[PDB]
Amino acid sequence: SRFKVSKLMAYILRHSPWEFGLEPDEEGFVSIEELVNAVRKVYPWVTEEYIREIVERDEKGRYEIRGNKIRARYGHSYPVILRHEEDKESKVLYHGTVRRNLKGIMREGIKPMKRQYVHLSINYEDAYNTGMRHGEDVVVLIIDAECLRNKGYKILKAGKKVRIVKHVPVDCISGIL
Ligand SMILES: [Cl-]
Ligand SMILES: [Cl-]
């Protein structure tokens, strides 16, 4: 199924490419032909055409293909430089978290995992569902994207709804939902 193969693709491209013999470049790209060979170790019926179809049909824009190169657009647990197109249009974004984090966030702002990027959403429901990954008592922060930009932060379009930014200062948190 598309779901099973996509879940494996996301694991390989975000978390464990070397386990499958793949060496991502600094931007997270691997050869799509080598990715097919890797995936076929688990699902031998997969084809390059199938992987390209998964990329084209993905509801979140999880993946990006350029020529012969494929990457995950977000969610890596290893260092990447993501030169995604800038979101210059959003006025408001959302960050899902858990209530226990408010104390720290209200003192320090939102910091990323591994000093990478903070993940934001254009959509409240997506932010809520993301926050549920860290606990049941979810709150969604409203982020003033214009004030982020005015402080010098570039907000990048990582997926259809996912946006990434280096840091969110407390001054740009405009509400809690
Ligand atoms: Cl909590
Ligand atoms: Cl996750």
Swiss-Prot record:
Enzyme Commission designation: 2.7.1.-
Superkingdom of source: Archaea
Record's signal peptide: none
Pfam families xrefs: PTS_2-RNA (PF01885)
Transmembrane spans: none
Enzyme class: transferase
InterPro entries the record matches: Ptrans_KptA/Tpt1, RNA_2'-PTrans_C, RNA_2'-PTrans_KptA, RNA_2'-PTrans_N
Disulphide bonds in the chain: none
Gene Ontology biological-process annotations: tRNA splicing, via endonucleolytic cleavage and ligation
GO molecular function terms listed in the Swiss-Prot or TrEMBL record: NAD+ poly-ADP-ribosyltransferase activity; tRNA 2'-phosphotransferase activity
Described purpose of this protein according to its UniProt entry: Removes the 2'-phosphate from RNA via an intermediate in which the phosphate is ADP-ribosylated by NAD followed by a presumed transesterification to release the RNA and generate ADP-ribose 1''-2''-cyclic phosphate (APPR>P). May function as an ADP-ribosylase.
Family annotation (NCBIfam families): PRK00819.1-2 (NF002013)
HAMAP family per the UniProt record, alphabetical: KptA
Family assignment from sequence similarity: Belongs to the KptA/TPT1 family.
Protein name, entry field: Probable RNA 2'-phosphotransferase
Natural source organism: Pyrococcus horikoshii (strain ATCC 700860 / DSM 12428 / JCM 9974 / NBRC 100139 / OT-3)
Lineage, uppermost ranks: Archaea, Methanobacteriati, Methanobacteriota, Thermococci, Thermococcales
